[model samples]
Target: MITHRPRGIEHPYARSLDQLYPAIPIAGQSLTIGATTSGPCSRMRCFVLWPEHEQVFDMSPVNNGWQTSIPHLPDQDATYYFEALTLDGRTETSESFPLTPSHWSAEPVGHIDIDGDRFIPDSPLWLVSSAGTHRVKFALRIEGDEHVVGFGERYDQLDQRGLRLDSVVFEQYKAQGKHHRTYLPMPFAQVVNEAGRAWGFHVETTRRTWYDVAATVSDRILIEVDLGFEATPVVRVNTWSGSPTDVLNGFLDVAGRPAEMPEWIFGLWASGNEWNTQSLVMEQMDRHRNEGIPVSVVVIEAWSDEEGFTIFRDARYVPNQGQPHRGPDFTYPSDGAWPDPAGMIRELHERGIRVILWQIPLQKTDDDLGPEALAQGNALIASGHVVKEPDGTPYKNRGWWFPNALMPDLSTEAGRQWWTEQRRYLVEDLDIDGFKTDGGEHAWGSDLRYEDGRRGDEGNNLYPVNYARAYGDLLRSAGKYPVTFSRSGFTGSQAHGLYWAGDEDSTWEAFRSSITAGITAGACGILYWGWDLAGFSGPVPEAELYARAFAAATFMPIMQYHSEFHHHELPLRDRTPWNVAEQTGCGELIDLARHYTRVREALRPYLVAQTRQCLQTGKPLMRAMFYDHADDPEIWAHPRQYMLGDELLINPVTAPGATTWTTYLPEGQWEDYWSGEVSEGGHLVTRAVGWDIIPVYRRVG
Candidate 1:
């Protein structure tokens, strides 16, 4: 039998380790501690010999080997060492069971009475090995006082204390639904007690992950894993040391944060998928201005009408059947329908509305310049560096609405550089602001290998992140600030720009969930977020849904309203008051759009100030009720209502024919924004809902 031993393991319990030691490569600032043990144990913990304390983890096996994770250490220094208890009733530890500068920050004490205090793997499902498949399960105990939050962009409640989620970027039909997986996957969560104490951490591996937050086993979080990640898992954690606000900021400080957005973008924006023709585009902009609607930016989405941009796919080199028509093409739109896009943008600019185009991270098998760029030598295939199979045939994806073409391997510099020039030319030559980077949530080539040596799954979550980065690079290269709107991301995507919630049906449920998604995104460092304001699908919304969605969008960082109705031949879903008024008596939705849009513009100074702070401290612009009232057990886990910064607290009333809705005001003095009625805080109050009423309260000065 042959076995391979890894070098520089350096764990005190080195001899028991088969392939890897618990020691870590990165010198984590509470100087990180970690280990990979192949011993006969499934539960691991760090025991402080002097003061009795335990850092416990139910270990899971990875790569067919026993594994362990030593999360970031707490600041309270005490003599400690690592130890484990086995399922087969065995206690395992080598001489250096846990000691070293890089392993942990403390040392062990001499022999003491650890008889009754020592921990054992108590839960039967603590570290379960699957009987049928390569699945491993474990759990971490949660205190009764803990309130958990943070799983990227979940469209559920504000707190994730009792939910089961697969931590992978799943492509769903409507992204604005509850209990569904996410388009953004990061293995991190924040748990806070009733007293505002909080801590959060992220497992630092680009692998398929899962989390069950205090749901299955009421008092613990069950984490299940698949044994295919190429690396030994290491968890980088933050122990309870800061306030909930400070905890989120501190966590993102270590992870990363994004750049400041221009103040202009905070106003209402418009977008549609079918505005392909120039006359229709101008008509939409004119309608907004003519109706007194405050438009800060206008986005032209998927209207490229090119052989490539919105509909880029090459029909020639499909690796499989049911692959769409042709490969997607990405190039300047010389197709005449958009005769002068520059003139249209300049026209919008004169009207004080910035113009943004749309982009996707794909190109067809061959483009307009098919083989022209590569005709010289072994150059990158058209559109991007070809991710080729063994036979030199470029990898093709079977993604929905995605092309049957060569994918730009954004992992490599050449790949990222090859396509950014196109965006740069669009920005400089066409004089465009930035782009709405859509459709990145589509999973493409999930198992293919790339030039960077990482496979498709490894790049899935990071693909859109890098794709957005490519756009940011274009803006910066043109001496412009970086800004790219995205719908897909991983852990570190905020370092780019905004993330709009993807397509959703025009329903009140989808509308309400959009707010919760933003709150969750904000908690995970995606501070600036937006969504299709009036919903993207279904028939055009009735007056109530449209008005309510518009009102709620006012509180978000970006109010870009987009939909799938732009191309409807009958103009049934057009976003005009005439449509709403003609179909439903709620034509007043137009008045509300005009009203709150102007309101968002008027609140720009405060919104800009709030965004500036979130830009610095990672605070969310739209705050969940518990964000401020952390000790208020009443609103700790719900997302029904939220605050728009420190001043305005909102109680959205899109809740079906309900005349009276309940609103919880935190402990303070409050005055209604519209009624001017004064009310005492720290209690749930019922407020009357009206169509013209924007149920908001101002914190007393």
Candidate 2:
């Protein structure tokens, strides 16, 4: 049974309430104070409360005892104050002191107008309020000579030596007809001067937000936040100016690294939507290898026999029994559809490429779970029936085809364990390497209770995270970092798997937007991220766009292509290397992709090293120019360009057919990685190039 303590004075300046305590800090850090029990405390509705606009805190019922820690706070100088509410409603306060000695001070380099809000120096944080939500945005400028570090899980670029950084967080969709955003709040920027001293600014808020780090004149680093009103406002700053070892050690505890990914998984893979038949998939694989393209994994999109139903199907009822639901001609492994699951897995294994299958968690109308399963209850239903709207009718949407049920409630121990066991079957029994976990972002809308009695929007948003956790836990238990291509996510989603930018069209604009989106995702601590190589849903990219897109994708953590080319009536040509060679004048582009693929493979060592740092230090691999040049006035307004790894700078061409691109060279000697041309820093320079070329350079000593 759940218990609640009443609100009353337990200590000076504070009150004890029925809500759960032993609160854990946001980002799995340390514990901190929460809200009053008397009213709603914004986005948080659990035992521990975090303002929608502030940092995060957790209160898990663990091992029958409550353990808490503030994960983001400094160990030495960080201080906490508590107060108890008296019977008269008055409260007392406590004193504040250093939480940890790793603290440093910051000064603003400059500020930008976010939607017209003048976020100035000393007033780096801004709050946006919307629809019962508040989002906080802020910037921290480090003045003294110190090194900067820590944002969140990034691919690792050096300790950002001689660089400044701005961290931001926000939400995005994976595909069309899907509406969910992965929540990330561990946004931070560290500033370090030549003497090796550093100060770090950490933003802990749950709202959708963005940050801009700009280095300006006078050795100043400016941090800015773009606030969305539906979030809470809370910011915490830490300073570290001592040794690099100490800073690295401190961050390691906050972000723990996963074991290195197996080397075999690093090869070139062919992935796309609707590689429906085994023969077709095998043919493609053979064709690629025969052509010396070196394919490692072949992704099969929606190849199940259970039409319309994602994972669950009811055995008794058939929708439109007389009508032919698409036959096994399109579905593999179905007895009536195709009948060859074992053979398919064996063939792929023989060819030295892994297989990935697509599945969603939602249960459809004809799910095969027996009445015993539904009654004894493996199914997700409220009061023995699927939840419905107030009109007493099931809420229906375009995607589901029929009323759908949520994946079994995973917030409960029994539910999560059950789902894990099911995934184990997929991995061990079916020999599947990974899952393209699609859908759940658009959860059914209804007023119903989960088995645990969770209600409202919480019910909707919570499923994806819990579902992902179950899958990730399963993979982790087997001693492997589970690779999931998930859609919607929330706070802590980074702990699950890699995320790709959702459902963008095959256009120049979408391609351009992906670069910024990737930068933003990296800053938010999602280190391993990517997007559809040549756009997920649109006309096949022209030769120039295809080459440019592929080049851009090379810089991301993972590179894959996805789209509806196979499903279209006209059947747009495939995006394989051979196809590109046939369609585009430059067959060399395919060769280029192959060459870069090898480069990416060789960089795995560096990438893994960065991944470890991101998990340990909360620093990101992709960084804004200002993150490294916090005191450079010229870089304050530049967002289109970014640093790829400390060694490589990327300036994406956002416009179509533009022969020249303008970029700012920081205070250093820069060499063009492509042409070996040298350019001096401290000014904006425009370089001319063909459509197939991107502006990339290296820092020269």
Candidate 3:
């Protein structure tokens, strides 16, 4: 018997007869097809049947398989099948495949042209596939020294040329560069020429897409999109051409610009995953106050029950099934973990700190789930509010974290209402200022079904968008401002709320990556963004690393410190200034933190006012140097240093024992923020750095 695999596979692998390599052959390139045989075969042959002509070719044996190669085919469609004649005079035939030769085919699927001149190159898009296969690949050609940037919170370098990239919302944990993944990825990129001409393109589908940015062919950017069993696939790419600023504005016009946030978000934000109990949170808040550190937002990460994300842990409440719960519907136990949830929020507000509770869009399947949580899960299943599998069963979490958890289908109005009502009290009664919307990457499996009639492949990346949107709408409906801090999102996530770089270790490499992440995220039109000071998991950073990170955070859009859960362990991995100082035994860190906090507070008014103008013009608050200095080629070499607002230029020190930092100042007269030393721009400046100093410059009036 002879079995045949589908097309488009690599060479020199075991012939499973499952894949055919080079399914869509070019007009001049050769094509090869292979198959494996189990029974004895005296002769094997392949029949190439073109639409106008038919030809037969003999097959050769290679590595337990029979293979044949076509020297060349015309620029036309064809069909082919395999046949084997056995020694016993029996004949076997394999399934036939229809192949379409890839050629220059151009068609408009509707695009908004920024310059009124379409940069649409001839045959910029191509679809390659074979019949009876669910796989399809869309390829593009990126010519010349065009540097592509902005793929949504990328942790790697700012220029994505000569690298492989992906667009998907993922929970990659740490080492995002090593893994080539991101918590937030969009299928959009701005292609900028070295001469300062800029244009951009965005794949308009939410399916998982891979971008090979001239990494393979040197002059071609290849895109591979996976469309599973889709009867009608429309792979549309929206393109626009203009200057860098105009390209960004045009992209935001389609992706939706971020809304203006409250002025308080410009102040210092602090958190630790271990501060689960009310006493611990208070202790940290009091420490900040006593140390003279000005903190405006306190995010409580571990305040929720393990079973249900919306419920407060250790709080006494009856199962209120019919309507939403208020303050009178629950009781805060005096000896419980949360003991007095409302009172804790009140005290934090009184201390001039707004509280943002953490959230995961999941109905966890803890084996030890209590009756109330179990009943809630059952109701979600019964009401069809959760994402469903292909067989209409509730889809369970596929990621390593939060195993077997069920996620609500935030894509639908009913599902969103059900999830929102569960936490409306947090904003309305407890007076929580915002939500640290975490874990929006839990939606996995392409076969998973949503109530909006979308498959997971079409809706997975959108889950985070809707996740943040639902919460934002909930806050707006409660007569409160929509402030959500999210870690995962796709193309239009900038309109929802603020964002943060996800988990990373307390290493110098991670610190540098975080800097690039902020710059790239801002370039993608994310107005507010930050990262955990230094890192979130593993051991606490060295005093130098902590100090260096805090000093950099002082100039970022949202200054926050967050740590992973350590189960209240020793050497406390909390990112609090005093805790980090006590663990590292460096009293200078406390002074550094206090000084930077004061500096951050001093910049609040400027940040708030700049953010308003940034929102109006679709300019990011934190931007890469090239955004403003595209005419100066030297600025492209500096990605770590960025422009904070329109006036302040920030160059963070990311190395250990950084006694000095060498940074490039763009073309402008600049004044040092610390020393008031005026220097001409367009040159590299070396300056001394300490725990209390990061290289920041302001444009001279």
Candidate 4:
């Protein structure tokens, strides 16, 4: 160290606020710009000029940084810079920066129609380019005590007041609350006032959109959309004003409405990743049958040759490297894990249990892929059907879930046909009922290329939409109902098949957060949704958690239980009713699941009717409290409670060791489903609870 040359004096440089909050400014609004330094710095000062004059504003040290508030920005462009003192006792000046904001002009969206209504904006939507970053920023005026709701599958708060969120679909494996990223996010939300008259907005772009729901600015909602270097940005912003339902209906009128679904979709679905072999699946079904549990659907996750995601594992097939393969081309070995795949499906159909196979859109590139899948992967790259890098090479997946996998671009007709033709055998010959569409969040990198001539910035979020649609469309073309169970999607995913709250652990916190996810997702027009019965990714759930979760799931649009595989590890993590009972040594778990399965079956007619109504009226099957009681401020206080359809109100017991539960009735006569007890409206009802009972109430006339 002594041999090294003397250290040069370090200087402090001004940090840009280009990517930070308050980066974009609105005219007539007060703002505070702060100075951040790298090295030892002090006495930071800013110089701002509005062309007419220049002013030197000195900043005082506040909380380890220096900042000064500007009373109000002028309606003109401005440039600014900073001066600070370094530890060497010398004043350092930073490079001058421009604070020029794009001027906006108001325009009516007469060309856009929502039912009989049109989107009218109070302020102008401005496209701005600042510090080499491009975005579209706009504002909406807020009223007294306004609540913003719906951003798609939010796991945190129901009322999104004072929250900054985005519309980027992310695969945050679990704990979505901590990350605040959703598997399903839409740039659509409703802003309601105290009197209940409301207006909502939907950004008509697939780009990643941000919503500051009165967070940065208390009196206004600031929206910023990420537009990737468009010289002339063409963006469409739609707004609807009316009651909450009317606003949602109006928004749905433009952003495609849900189709009427089949009644069998309302039945119970069961799955576990460890149910890889056919015997394991049959054994689980047998257990359900023996316990008197009504199971309607079984989703097989690990049945595929883990590489191509097309054929069954251990099945004998000469890999079709040059073309697609059908069911008759493959032969099943009697000693294989699947044995006779077609025969197994036939048995499942005979037992009235529909079968769904899992899927991913990636072509595996791992070293472990068999020769067949390796050739198929090469064929995909050679055919130019996969997504590509900027240089036109196949873009390998960057996410940790599945690294180095080549994703098929579901963006073009050729890509879609090429991808779906490989799995046509599953639907045509095998007669599988549906697909468990998983892992649709793998498309990353803004520089990626699609065959449809779109950059990843524009087409990334739409991957899941197309992924589900491709599978659904394939089923439809084969004269089958397009029953797809997807975990990730963005806007327009509502028109696809069902969705489930993605991965979570076997904890009470996960259960509680799943309830919020369901309600918020429904608020965004997701008609069919459910979650893993307890949780899918950890040790078996506690008996009480399972019972409570099952109780709540009985009322969901689609009831499902699933689990993750543990790599042949000891103490399997399956959330099966029999496994939970065996692990907890509580025999009541089986009976609890049986009771809820029957309860779900008995409510199928009502579920189908409500779902049809939801499709027709643009209402959610699992309607949020705001849909009915937006005028009631107290409804926001109970985020975990919701109206299951229009006639039923659900209040799930979310906490552990909760014996007594209190529920708020939103101004109606409610009849307790369990006790037949009637309670008056606009009041709180308290009742005792056990592991078996959930506080669900039916609306009384």
The 10-residue segment with the lowest total lDDT in model 3? 8-17
List per-prediction Cα lDDT, in the order shown. Answer: 0.64, 0.51, 0.80, 0.80
**Which 10 residues in a row give candidate 1 its minimum summed lDDT?**
109-118
Candidate 3 wrongly placed segments (more than 4 Å): 1-145, 321-323
Cα lDDT tens digits, model 2, 531-590, are 778776655677777777876776666677666545545544567766666766667867
Worst 10 residues of 2 by lDDT: 5-14
Model 3 lDDT tens row, 33-65: 777778889889889898778988898888648
Return the lDDT, model 4, position 417.
85
Candidate 1 residue lDDT tens string, 549-653: 777788777887776844467646755555656677665677777778778877899998877776666678877666677877777634667777778888777
lDDT of 4 by residue, 359-428 (tens): 9888778868788888888888888889898788898886656678999989987788888998898999
Evaluated at residue 488, the lDDT of candidate 4 is 94
* Candidate number with the higher TM-score (1 or 3): 3
Would you give me the overall lDDT of model 2? Answer: 0.51
In model 1, the runs with Cα more than 4 Å from the true position are: 1-137, 175-179, 225-240, 310-335, 366-384, 387-393, 443-447, 565-567
A best-first ranking of the candidates according to their lDDT comes to 3, 4, 1, 2
Which has the better lDDT: candidate 3, or candidate 4? 3
Instruction: Arrange candidates by TM-score, descending.
Output: 3, 4, 1, 2
